[PDB]
């Protein structure tokens, strides 16, 4: 099984809400130290959200006020968008980094296609 469970595509309603699942089974001994969500445009991704040691940070203006990332359940870093725009259609990447105190590091990422339907 892949570490991150992310569907190959999600369809959301124009002007409404969508959830992009990204989940994993936490492993004892590792700490989640970074979550990044990225969006494609067009041959390179840009970071739209970071969760780091200083909290949650939206990183692109067009997502300000419209983007939430789950945090309640360990292993669930799903992203929700509000007031979906046609220009939100793209491929989105969930990227998670784990470390140990002695410095080992593991990273995984996974891509979903967001479709927006009228």
């Amino acid at each position, epitope marked *: 099984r892949p570490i991150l469970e992310v569907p190959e595509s999600v369809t959301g309603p124009w002007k409404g809400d969508v959830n992009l699942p990204c989940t994993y089974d936490p492993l004892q001994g590792y700490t989640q130290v970074l979550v990044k969500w990225l969006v494609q445009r067009g041959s390179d991704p840009v970071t739209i959200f970071l969760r780091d040691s200083s909290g949650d940070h939206i990183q692109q203006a067009k997502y300000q006020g419209r983007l939430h990332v789950s945090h309640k359940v360990p292993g669930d870093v799903s992203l929700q968008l509000s007031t979906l725009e046609m220009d939100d259609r793209s491929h989105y*990447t969930c990227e998670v980094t784990w470390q140990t105190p002695d410095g080992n590091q593991v990273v995984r990422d996974k891509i979903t296609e967001l479709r927006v339907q009228k």
Partner: nanobody
Amino acid sequence: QVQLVESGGGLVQAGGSLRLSCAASGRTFSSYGMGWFRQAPGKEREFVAAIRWNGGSTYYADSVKGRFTISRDNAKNTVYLQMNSLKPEDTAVYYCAAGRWDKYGSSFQDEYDYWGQGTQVTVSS
């Protein structure tokens, strides 16, 4: 699908050269990371090379660095493995795989969802 179809295998002399191809079906090729794996007799499947969806980065097993080159053509829905300076240790069945990793995890077979039936490579002393 994607269905993945490999070709290009053969029996070659040590020092020689082959090129494997992998033809993908569907229209979603360009969104997948692509990789090559191999399985030698009486051994487990192992990573060989991978290439990001956008061609931006490539990744190689240490043992094939500088001898093998992976490339892709998103317009022709094909991935290639140029295999130069072949060694007997390179003998194996070679498999093409597609996954939705972006730039991490490409060495792990578990991070791929589609696999071809493979093509056979033998390198002789």
